[PDB]
Write a protein that binds this DNA or RNA. Structure first.
Length: 53
DNA sequence: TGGCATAGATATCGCACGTCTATTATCCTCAGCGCAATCAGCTGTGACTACCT
């Protein structure tokens, strides 16, 4: 199941990247949660929105 | 005949409009101290009586 569902659909809708840890959009975080640019530079894009692990 | 503009048809993302339980220091109460006019006992003074001369 993990192998099948590892980034298979490849969604590119802004709403889908929210509350989705597999994508973890920078703008779709919380006040207390924050990205780490050291281990996440770029993994994908959606309407000019970068993806971080 | 064929290139593609121009609008019909349709969602689509952003801005704005509702709730919800807590990223962290209160509000009264009783016991313990204190302050100011009586009242009573320690100590001083006079009245009464013992003893050395």
């Amino acid at each position: 199941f993990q192998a099948k569902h590892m980034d298979q659909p490849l969604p590119t809708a802004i709403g889908l990247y929210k509350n989705h840890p597999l994508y973890a959009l920078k703008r779709h975080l919380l006040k207390y949660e924050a990205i780490y640019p050291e281990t996440a530079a770029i993994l994908g894009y959606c309407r000019g929105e970068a993806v971080y692990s």
